[PDB]
Design a protein around this ligand. Structure first.
Ligand code: UP6
Ligand code: UP6
Lengths: 211, 212
């Protein structure tokens, strides 16, 4: 990923989202689009971004349903042009396999979310995280998401998945995570608010890269 | 809910979804719309269904993000006209609280998903389910979702949330759950494929209602 930095574009109106993404395009070539923007502006926004900025798009949909529904969600998402989709591992192996099957059929990728970065993640997710990561390895998952806010957990996750797996990590900046420390374990960092709420998003992105 | 039956409308094209929903409207007045339909036809489909069929709409979005993002998802969903939203409890109390705060601000409801009905739910969700339900009670959640496929777990869930809470349950029909047994514990059952993939959805819905 360009500069090992992925922009989390969670603004909810198309004009602001287009403005910020265009301003930071010289620093990042991969954008993570989630439900805040998609449910506000429509799925067509994925193809619009891919074309206008020539960036890879990761759909952060935290897929977390039964197998049959997960398949439908993944198919609609890849039809919309997403290059990859983020899926929760807490619902179990069959739910993750359903996403992997659709990605295989459509020539796309699945990122498995193992542990989340917010405080509430300590209640139930953290205790299941190592097992969720091992499940991913057993299913053949090669792309993972882990927390910038807990580098000791990111280290443990990297250990389970190996150095060959691709690991991206949110929670940098606004949630307290540090870019440099996170990149000791993750291949790329995800940054949203620290860039998109900045008075000068380009300067904020440039600063992160400088750091 | 009318006849204690909620239709899970997971068809992915507007014309088919409109046809089936209209055919079974005399049997059910509450429709659950999820991402399969919304990501295929747009969020405007929620208001269209609400108006066209005069039914309550539950947005089954299995919200499962950090607090800040959950707030945005809930706000966009209620702006689109949904009467309620289904949220996962596994990400923790702060994430659930964020959804409850937006529902309070907008005069809407949050349904907390405690245990899922599919086989994979046994891996991680089941072992956390009782605690997730208790967390819901502690947060003031009054609406819950539990599995038709495991009535013993549904009974345990009803036990934690009390008789005053509203409990709806998917997994009836296609996934193996039984309407009658599920209604021993849930206030309403959710049915998707058994109705929408039937050669005659109205007859399928009518049969379910007669079996209970
Ligand atoms: O454990 C996780 C998984 N995903 N995200 C997501 O990554 C982005 C982080 O944004 P932020 O830089 O503004 O905090 C948001 O889209 C958020 O939903 C997290 O924050 N934590
Ligand atoms: O634990 C859960 C939670 N939600 N659903 C959802 O309820 C519906 C059940 O549909 P079905 O009757 O066709 O199996 C689908 O929309 C599905 O995503 C389940 O099946 N199980």
């Amino acid at each position: 990923v360009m500069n090992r930095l992925i922009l989390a574009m969670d603004l909810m109106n198309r004009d602001d989202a287009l403005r910020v993404t265009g301003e930071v395009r010289e620093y990042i070539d991969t954008v993570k689009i989630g439900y805040p923007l998609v449910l506000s502006e429509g799925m067509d926004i994925i193809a619009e971004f891919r074309k206008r900025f020539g960036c890879r798009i990761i759909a952060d949909f935290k897929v977390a349903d039964i197998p049959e529904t997960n398949e439908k969600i993944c198919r609609a998402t890849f039809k919309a042009g997403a290059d990859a989709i983020i899926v929760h591992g807490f619902p179990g192996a069959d739910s993750v396999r359903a996403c992997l099957n659709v990605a295989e059929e459509m020539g796309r990728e699945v990122f498995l979310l193992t542990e989340m970065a917010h405080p509430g993640a300590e209640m139930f997710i953290q205790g299941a995280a190592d097992e969720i990561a091992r499940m991913g390895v057993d299913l053949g998952v090669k792309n993972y998401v882990g927390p910038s806010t807990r580098p000791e957990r990111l280290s443990r996750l990297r250990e389970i998945i190996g150095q060959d797996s691709f690991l991206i990590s949110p929670g940098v900046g606004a949630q307290g995570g540090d870019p440099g420390e996170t990149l000791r374990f993750a291949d790329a960092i995800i940054v949203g608010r620290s860039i998109y709420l900045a008075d000068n998003p380009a300067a904020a992105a440039a600063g992160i890269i400088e750091s």
